[PDB]
Design a protein around this ligand. Structure first.
Ligand SMILES: CC(C)=CCn1nc(-c2ccc(O)cc2O)c2cccc(C(F)(F)F)c21
Ligand SMILES: CC(C)=CCn1nc(-c2ccc(O)cc2O)c2cccc(C(F)(F)F)c21
Lengths: 239, 230
């Protein structure tokens, strides 16, 4: 089971679980309009969705959850997860968001003003990871943490099983924390640097939550989808 | 620079000394929060000026931090107040609400409750608490300064440096309470992850103000700037 993994076995499992990078619908009309871009982002996200489920089911400890909790965690975290993907992808492309390898946009290219604030936010984050020289093995830990953390406070409670599930999530989070710290020691950071890096990394998740909330906000503000329903996800979950 | 030299114990002591008082609700739900919020904000600005590192920022930077953190700061105070009242939110000593007295915003109410209860199972400590509060003041708005000029870059480093001193401070508090090296970093992580949840609740909150046509209760950049300058 998942709580038994060493830190080395946790990084390995997480690396192996990695989803693939997808391409954007090939050769769209350029220049873009506001909706054409959104049609492209939306299409891409939907296609990534399928793969994130495959990825989520291989996150040590995810499967031990009832289906209901697996869905609720994904519901809450999916955009955050895409967004950290993006920001990772974009690190060595100052000024640009690499949504797909055939879809690399600067702040002017794509066609709203609330959108450009998010874009700006994604760019900032990406620089920050670049500044911190974020490592791949750290990124997979962070992405996993996002998955297990984002929706855990809103399980709601009561029943003993509801408490068990929350307690299990929290224990997996702890091993991921042990894993991050292990990577940091391994790399030769002092304890003090280790603690500090861990904090700096985790604080960034709060910004990623914020951006997701902003993004979700916008998504709900179109008369179109375009946001995976509970049943959609449940289904996608049964093997 | 001052702030960067503090010890873990001096940092905590500065932070406890700076705590706002707990105010009473003076005397519709939106009515009561607005009355309370408005009075609390005055105190929050004076608390903020006392957070080590914070006055070393430019006034425009102080304002942006506050503008970004204000609801999360209210909210976290609320969760800490309610910690010892499971099932209830202690808005004020004379305004302690249960889930059922909770029109819209029962979602936010529930989340608030869940956070409080998370606090309670964690045995969250007053000293840890004040450290998290400060972390939020300095973290929530730092990624959106605007870099550009040399100053804005110097301001960002300085914030990150203070944040690191709050990190050392939390760890010190845990090492001193007896936690093992392992338990220290797991607890530091559990603490900070909760902050994502607070951000989340704050955003839902704002969302809810705008759909209540209550956009007005928000402190504006200029409102904030005038209060700081006093
Ligand atoms: C241009 C802006 C402000 C984007 C925010 N955003 N980002 C992605 C996304 C899709 C795939 C991916 O891998 C990573 C992503 O971040 C995305 C997908 C749908 C809607 C939005 C939104 F929120 F803008 F409406 C999205
Ligand atoms: C100005 C307004 C109404 C903000 C909205 N607000 N304010 C507080 C809050 C206020 C003061 C305080 O001491 C503690 C609090 O938690 C609060 C708590 C729960 C939900 C909301 C909601 F949904 F309106 F955003 C809240």
């Amino acid at each position: 089971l998942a709580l038994s993994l060493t830190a080395d076995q946790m990084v390995s499992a997480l690396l192996d679980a990695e989803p693939p990078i997808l391409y954007s619908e090939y050769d769209p009309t350029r220049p873009f309009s506001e909706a054409s871009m959104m049609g492209l982002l939306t299409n891409l996200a939907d296609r990534e969705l399928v793969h994130m489920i495959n990825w989520a089911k291989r996150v040590p400890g995810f499967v031990d959850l009832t289906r209901h909790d697996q869905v609720h965690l994904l519901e809450c975290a999916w955009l955050e997860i895409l967004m950290i993907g993006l920001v990772w992808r974009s690190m060595e492309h100052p000024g640009k968001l690499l949504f797909a390898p055939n879809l690399l946009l600067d702040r002017n290219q794509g066609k709203v003003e609330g959108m450009v604030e998010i874009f700006d936010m994604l760019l900032a984050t990406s620089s920050r990871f670049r500044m911190m020289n974020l490592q791949g093995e750290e990124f997979v830990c962070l992405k996993s943490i996002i998955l297990l953390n984002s929706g855990v406070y809103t399980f709601l409670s009561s029943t003993l099983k509801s408490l068990e599930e929350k307690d299990h999530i929290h224990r997996v989070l702890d091993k991921i924390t042990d894993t991050l710290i292990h990577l940091m020691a391994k790399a030769g950071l002092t304890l003090q640097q280790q603690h500090q890096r861990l904090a700096q990394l985790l604080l960034i998740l709060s910004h990623i939550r914020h951006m997701s909330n902003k993004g979700m906000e916008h998504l709900y503000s179109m008369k179109c989808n375009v946001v995976p329903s509970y049943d959609l996800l449940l289904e996608m979950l049964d093997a």
